[PDB]
Design a protein around this ligand. Sequence first.
Ligand SMILES: CCCCCC/C=C/CCCCCCCCCC(=O)O[C@H](COC(=O)CCCCCCCCCCCCCCC)COP(=O)(O)OC[C@@H](O)CO
Ligand SMILES: CCCCCC/C=C/CCCCCCCCCC(=O)O[C@H](COC(=O)CCCCCCCCCCCCCCC)COP(=O)(O)OC[C@@H](O)CO
Ligand SMILES: CCCCCC/C=C\CCCCCCCCCC(=O)O[C@H](COC(=O)CCCCCCCCCCCCCCC)COP(=O)(O)OC[C@@H](O)CO
Ligand SMILES: C/C(=C/CC/C(C)=C/CC/C(C)=C\CC1=CC(=O)c2ccccc2C1=O)CC/C=C(/C)CC/C=C(\C)CCC[C@H](C)CCCC(C)C
Ligand SMILES: C/C(=C/CC/C(C)=C/CC/C(C)=C\CC1=CC(=O)c2ccccc2C1=O)CC/C=C(/C)CC/C=C(\C)CCC[C@H](C)CCCC(C)C
Ligand code: HEC
Ligand code: HEC
Ligand code: HEM
Ligand code: HEM
Ligand code: HEM
Ligand code: HEM
Ligand code: FES
Ligand code: FES
Lengths: 134, 134, 236, 236, 395, 395
Amino acid sequence: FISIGIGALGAVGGLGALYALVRVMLEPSEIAALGAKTEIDVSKIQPMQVRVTSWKGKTLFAIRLPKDYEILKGHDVFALVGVCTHLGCIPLWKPVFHCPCHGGLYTPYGDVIGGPPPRPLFIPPQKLEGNKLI
Amino acid sequence: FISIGIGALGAVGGLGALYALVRVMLEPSEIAALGAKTEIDVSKIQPMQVRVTSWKGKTLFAIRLPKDYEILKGHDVFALVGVCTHLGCIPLWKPVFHCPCHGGLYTPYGDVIGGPPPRPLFIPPQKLEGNKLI
Amino acid sequence: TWGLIKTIFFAGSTLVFFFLLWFYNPFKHVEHYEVDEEVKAIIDNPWKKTESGKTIAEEGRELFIASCSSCHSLRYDGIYIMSVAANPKWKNIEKTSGRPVYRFGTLYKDRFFVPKDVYEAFAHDDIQGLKASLGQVPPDLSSMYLARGEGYLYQFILNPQKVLPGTTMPQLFNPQFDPQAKEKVAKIVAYMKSVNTPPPKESAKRTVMGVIVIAYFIVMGLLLWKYRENLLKRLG
Amino acid sequence: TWGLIKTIFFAGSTLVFFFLLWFYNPFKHVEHYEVDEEVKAIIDNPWKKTESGKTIAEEGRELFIASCSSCHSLRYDGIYIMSVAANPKWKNIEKTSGRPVYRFGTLYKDRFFVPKDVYEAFAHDDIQGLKASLGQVPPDLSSMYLARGEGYLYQFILNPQKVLPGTTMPQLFNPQFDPQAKEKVAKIVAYMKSVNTPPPKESAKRTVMGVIVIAYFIVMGLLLWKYRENLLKRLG
Amino acid sequence: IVDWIDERAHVREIYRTQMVEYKVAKNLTFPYVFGILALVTFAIQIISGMVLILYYKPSIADAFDSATYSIMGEIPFGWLFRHIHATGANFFMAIVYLHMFTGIYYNAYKRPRELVWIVGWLIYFVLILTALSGYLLPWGQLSYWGFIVTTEIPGSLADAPILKPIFKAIAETIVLWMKGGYVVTDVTLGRVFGSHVLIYPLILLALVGIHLYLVRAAGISNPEGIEYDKKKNPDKFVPFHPYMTLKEGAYVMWYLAVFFFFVFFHISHFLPPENFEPANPLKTPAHIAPEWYLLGYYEVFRSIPSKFWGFVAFNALLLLLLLLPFLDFSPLKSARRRPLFFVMFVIFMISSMALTILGTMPPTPQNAKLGLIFAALVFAFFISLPIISFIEYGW
Amino acid sequence: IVDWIDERAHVREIYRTQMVEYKVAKNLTFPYVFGILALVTFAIQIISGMVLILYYKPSIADAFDSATYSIMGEIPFGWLFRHIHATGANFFMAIVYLHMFTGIYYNAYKRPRELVWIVGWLIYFVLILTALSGYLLPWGQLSYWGFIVTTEIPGSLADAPILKPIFKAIAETIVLWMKGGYVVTDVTLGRVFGSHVLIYPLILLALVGIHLYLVRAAGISNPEGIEYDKKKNPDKFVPFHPYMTLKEGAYVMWYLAVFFFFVFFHISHFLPPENFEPANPLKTPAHIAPEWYLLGYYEVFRSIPSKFWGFVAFNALLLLLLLLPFLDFSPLKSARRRPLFFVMFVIFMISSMALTILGTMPPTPQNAKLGLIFAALVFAFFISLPIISFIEYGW
Ligand SMILES: CCCCCC/C=C/CCCCCCCCCC(=O)O[C@H](COC(=O)CCCCCCCCCCCCCCC)COP(=O)(O)OC[C@@H](O)CO
Ligand SMILES: CCCCCC/C=C/CCCCCCCCCC(=O)O[C@H](COC(=O)CCCCCCCCCCCCCCC)COP(=O)(O)OC[C@@H](O)CO
Ligand SMILES: CCCCCC/C=C\CCCCCCCCCC(=O)O[C@H](COC(=O)CCCCCCCCCCCCCCC)COP(=O)(O)OC[C@@H](O)CO
Ligand SMILES: C/C(=C/CC/C(C)=C/CC/C(C)=C\CC1=CC(=O)c2ccccc2C1=O)CC/C=C(/C)CC/C=C(\C)CCC[C@H](C)CCCC(C)C
Ligand SMILES: C/C(=C/CC/C(C)=C/CC/C(C)=C\CC1=CC(=O)c2ccccc2C1=O)CC/C=C(/C)CC/C=C(\C)CCC[C@H](C)CCCC(C)C
Ligand code: HEC
Ligand code: HEC
Ligand code: HEM
Ligand code: HEM
Ligand code: HEM
Ligand code: HEM
Ligand code: FES
Ligand code: FES
């Protein structure tokens, strides 16, 4: 038929044009997801060594410690978003590791022992499957 | 009066708004004229020495030679837009001075003696008033 | 009448709302810093001439370059770190746009504005001992006057430990044993103010034209009102 | 009839005008360069696999990096000068956007695209012996395939003195005594082509959707025509 | 002359039809001029944005140096057109708020004006997006962070409700829509610039055209509520020109004087000083609540102790302005005519000002108690419209 | 349903008035669809430019890497919307040329359509600027240099005439207008981007609206020349819908098929390959004539051995399209009705195609002889319109 063929075909055309326009404008996909995996081989890092990385943006720390806030008990591996709190610097490693901007100290777990910062370093959500962190 | 006051005053307001809009959009003045003077002290340059400068953009040469195309006879000072011709490089000084991109030679006056370039270096318009070139 | 109460309520509450929403919300208690009033006049007029025919803005500029450009890069006026001196090109700063500073309304062909990405990639992306030692790159003082105010700028400088409790920015001017330090910080802040504030010649034309535009719109509205009122009598 | 002559003239001349204005103007005699046909198949399919499971595009990439990245910086694929190696950061190339190369439609997290101003200010604005010696900076091969064509690229490379009479770009592959040089230049041009041309998987979806859009508009116009013609009989 | 143009365009036949015999009402009160003023401010925004688009550069390393160095110091009269733009944005929100609030007063949403209110609510929604996306463009310290906090709000929907915690990765306006996905990069700033500059003002020109046509097709509602004595009762209409086209002609000039007072002499609050610091994504400012036209909803949000229910309230408070004409069903029209709706409208207007004011203050628990007390009263205005309707339906 | 929207918007009353009882002519030939097609291509350009504005960055070091790297490789379907844009620009010039040329054929500029032709010539002039300024934006090798050579043309006015050599520094469109003054810098590219993207398409939307209104107010001219048998003679009109609204509905689809053939399968001439080299201001390409819609005037120019007189001819050839309705004064209307105007129009159309074709070839002296022979015939069409009018005025 015709009077319904025009409608069906116009709907198909509008759907294709809309798909293209949404795909161009509203789509950062497959380049936005950087990075959900965040490959962090924890078989390389030696104890009491942290790595600079990025999970959902900058930055990310990957601490590894054999023995002894504290949301998580001893797993010997985790990850913490490393940015100083009260003004936003980057603390450098080495038990505590402080940021040289003002003097804020931080335990290897993330809490603050002597605080110019008011709050600790937030635990970003993570996942460990074998020898990989998320 | 009133019915003419509104017209006079609306014309003044439209003229002011138009002046502002033209002054914002269509006006590179006093930063566009860089550079019409192009201060080139020719009391410093020693004979057979050229200077890198800019007249109406890049680039400009300022040659000074005591003795011997040739649009201009002996004035001992002039200026030539220095960019190689057949592909657009910058020849370096030293009687001829060539550009090392393909081997084009140029007399101290501007013409080509052995030409991968077809045409010489153009004489940009200039003005000499005392110890200054334009 | 009841319409009068309706009017002075629906307009009263609206004016009171936009008043304490658009200036002087009395329930926000942000802190204020005052200039020490030992000078308060070095800063009020940075274009005030001094001896040797140099304005306070210029004296503050050279004081900033000499004792403050060691770690801070006030662009918008061509002042970058002195490591190297000067930190931008070295060799050619002109062929990077890179353009000369042309502020209101005069240009300075001796100082150049290099973009934020060309600089700090050619300059500090080989991170010298600024982000390393301090941990904090000394950010940029190009528009820090507009963001802080002369009070905060004067009170921060010469006592950075007062404003922020701990801070690796040094005192660099310690009073109670330096008689000229207050005037030094005053000339520094006067310079930083002269970068973001139009000179008295340009700052007065703005006031004149702002008064004239408002007076133009008021009188044009008033003429339209009188015209309508005179025309409505020809018709009723 | 006279209307028929009017039609086949005002449409004939218009089609003949837009034909020799929009493709094959036979009066412009620009010169053409041909691939030597000794291969002509290394270039037609750069994604053609080879031994060791490496495509011709990849072999050309490493050949370009090894013997051509000495002076040319093919960005859009993360290949900058080898002085220094690699010329971009050194230290951190990631915090300059600086983003990873994400071409159609796969990204390479190992190679980074640095802007034209960050690069060549951090890299070559301390002019090493490239603009100095050659006088000409070796420009950029990122989009030189699209600008020259595989014929011109193959004929320029391996005999730069043929195309341009004098040129300080060296032969760098001299035939008549090198049996593999033609295949080397062929793999180089195949790589440079694989940077600007979508792979066969993506280049075929474009053809399919281009055929389908044209077939959609033709058939939609034809259905509108038939609808109008059937409706005009209900009315006359 | 002009007769030559009349014989070809019929301009005088359009004038004597659209202005001389338009027959507006006579008793139109002052707040009817807010539409004309919103249109004038729209023109101001377009005119001063066509100037800023010449010199603003949508790169992270180039923005805030275009707007603050280039526009303000380098360009002649560029300071003026950035002042005009940042002032017109706030004046354009304020005028549109007054417009819809005492278009609510006169119940200009009832029949036959249901459609003009739908188109007006679309205007309002896309105007929030045009002012919200244009605030990221200066790339200032609190511009960037108010954009972050404003686009992290739909992430609270992905928060687990008490039931059905599947919304994670559902309606992910965080990674899909603005914020570009985990990072605000150069591509995201380019996208926000392009949208704010051309995509939103075009679908505002279209929507304002449709709105202005629907106002004419439905006729402007008079503040009495009787809505007509048409074909009869002269001396009640006194046609548009010049009884109303010079009254608006003067109110527009006075509004422009009030506007150019803020443009020139008091703009320390439209270009806030603390936005003159270049944005760095590692340092968060102290108090980063959104801009004032969204604080009325930001105080409803972050007052419910849960985030998901706070987002649901955020969105129900917006959706109850769309469904407002379908929510109020009564023969009576104005608020002069409904003595019980006037009380609820005073409550609603007071509690909507109070939420916007409480949204500026820091989030103390007493502030949250107040923000709940006032959110309850703002919702009581919408929950009571059908009850008032049932009461008036029986007279 | 839809009746609910009709009672509030009166959409069916607008349909049955604008489409069912519009009463177009019946004998409208095919070239009357060129206006509808120009409007469709305008929509195509706006739609695909709203996409390119998201990712194009108006910086000298960033442009050509947005357009060539970002748009083409990084963005999904970005290749398609750059192909659509560069194809729509050339199709939009071609359609507008056909539109005005056989709107000249049917003499749709005579009374009472003098004003619609003036507005159409304004459309054409601002469209040259929108396509000329949008070509600089890719910042390619020949984009930049064709912009340079095109804006250096008004400098030939500053050239000394044989008399009064005062024009130097007079109408200095070199330093004042585009080219930014002695250098095309980042500020000039920002200015051209802003103008091309928003200032010119807005004053094209305004002008196209005015043009479409003036066409309706004056009525569409029929190709016979009698221009009416109105209030009488049925069976000559057969109203617009659906006799003409589905004929155009099909011609638009077929034109879009021809358009999307070039978009997909043959675009090596709209995005010319030699424009994929980043512009460097030190290397001039070999042949740098402007883009094809300006070659008809570029061949008149640079054919007169003088530059000043060449510029005067360049501008007189444009101005004689504005004054074309005032230049032709006759009762007769169509070219079917004037056997002596048809000959001059064939001469004009042939000699206007021939100039555009000769403008592509390199400037040999024989090419200049031909470009003068054809410029003379193009001017003879305008110099003969008043003579033909005097002849026809006496029948
Ligand atoms: C140099 C400095 C400047 C100097 C001063 C400038 C001039 C100022 C003039 C006043 C401007 C404000 C205008 C107030 C409105 C006029 C008052 C009014 O008219 O009252 C009502 C107006 O309604 C209406 O717009 C309703 C009123 C608007 C509602 C208030 C807006 C609230 C905004 C809140 C925004 C956040 C809320 C959204 C988030 C939930 C209607 O009353 P009526 O029953 O019809 O009777 C009218 C009388 O004349 C009787 O004849
Ligand atoms: C996949 C590949 C695609 C496949 C093919 C696609 C389809 C193509 C179809 C043809 C498209 C071209 C249309 C040609 C116009 C139709 C011909 C025509 O109709 O002829 C005349 C058209 O006028 C007019 O537009 C005048 C004609 C336009 C003039 C020519 C334009 C010149 C352009 C020059 C541009 C540079 C000049 C400017 C610089 C000075 C009018 O003739 P009539 O006397 O009224 O009699 C009409 C007959 O039907 C008799 O009944
Ligand atoms: C610098 C500022 C910008 C300038 C831009 C300029 C643009 C346009 C300028 C031209 C303005 C048009 C003025 C014409 C006024 C109409 C006069 C009129 O009133 O015309 C009427 C009909 O027009 C009608 O329907 C017409 C009504 C139907 C269409 C209404 C428009 C719909 C909404 C459009 C807005 C944008 C839509 C979205 C676009 C994508 C009357 O027609 P009659 O046959 O006699 O009687 C029939 C009965 O209706 C009697 O009432
Ligand atoms: C041509 C066209 C085709 C789109 C084809 C599509 C998406 C195919 C689906 C995707 C396909 C296959 C495969 C998947 C796919 C294809 C790729 O090429 C691709 C490329 C790069 C990365 C990834 C991909 C990818 O994933 C776009 C149309 C042109 C526009 C400008 C769209 C905007 C249109 C609007 C806004 C409405 C305007 C309609 C107007 C009123 C005309 C009415 C007449 C008719 C339309 C009914
Ligand atoms: C406020 C305003 C004032 C302009 C004031 C001017 C230039 C004064 C002249 C310049 C003066 C003193 C001194 C010289 C001068 C002043 C500087 O500030 C300055 C700053 C920096 C460098 C150099 C200078 C300088 O040289 C601009 C108006 C706002 C606009 C957006 C303009 C665009 C307007 C358009 C397009 C028409 C719209 C009209 C509209 C329909 C309303 C109708 C009602 C009424 C207007 C009749
Ligand atoms: C020894 C390094 C150093 C030098 C020299 C230095 N500063 Fe600082 N300054 C810093 C650092 C690091 C910061 C930013 C982080 C911090 O310390 O608070 C800063 C911040 C600032 C701030 C703003 C801080 C804020 O949060 O608003 C100002 C203003 C400032 N400096 C002014 C100056 C002036 C003026 C001088 C020259 C007299 C100067 N600085 C010299 C280290 C320095
Ligand atoms: C010893 C320096 C040098 C090296 C190594 C070099 N080139 Fe060149 N090449 C140049 C220079 C300089 C230019 C540009 C000016 C010129 O010489 O023509 C150039 C230009 C080019 C051009 C384009 C010229 C035009 O006008 O279109 C191409 C293509 C090219 N080179 C490819 C290559 C390839 C492929 C390699 C690696 C096999 C390479 N180049 C290695 C010096 C070099
Ligand atoms: C129509 C309603 C509009 C509103 C409510 C609005 C609002 C805003 C706001 C609040 C800003 C921030 C300015 C600042 O904080 O300094 C802004 C910036 C900007 N606007 Fe708009 N805008 C509107 C329309 C437009 C239009 C039509 C354009 C056309 C180009 C435009 C162009 C810009 C540009 C380029 C900027 C950034 C320049 C700057 O930082 O000042 N805007 N807008
Ligand atoms: C750019 C934004 C807007 C513009 C330019 C605009 C313009 C106008 C104008 C000129 C009128 C004429 C009647 C009058 O002046 O009161 C009007 C009427 C109206 N507007 Fe808007 N408006 C805008 C936004 C809105 C919004 C956001 C709403 C509702 C949420 C709205 C709802 C209405 C209603 C209900 C009327 C009818 C009033 C009545 O007939 O009594 N408008 N609009
Ligand atoms: C209306 C008539 C228009 C014409 C004739 C036109 C013509 C052109 C042309 C020829 C180009 C060069 C593209 C290339 O060579 O690759 C271009 C580029 C461009 N146009 Fe337009 N344009 C028009 C409208 C618009 C509009 C409304 C926009 C709205 C944003 C726009 C945005 C752009 C942008 C951003 C570019 C540069 C992007 C690129 O390099 O492809 N154009 N235009
Ligand atoms: C974006 C550009 C343009 C658009 C969208 C446009 C659109 C239209 C449309 C739809 C018509 C209806 C009648 C018809 O289809 O033939 C028309 C008529 C007309 N146009 Fe345009 N046009 C444009 C440019 C021009 C130009 C550049 C000229 C002249 C230089 C022009 C001159 C005319 C004339 C004379 C008519 C009346 C034809 C007649 O009534 O016989 N138009 N235009
Ligand atoms: S940021 Fe670490 S000390 Fe203030
Ligand atoms: S550029 Fe100097 S030789 Fe070709």
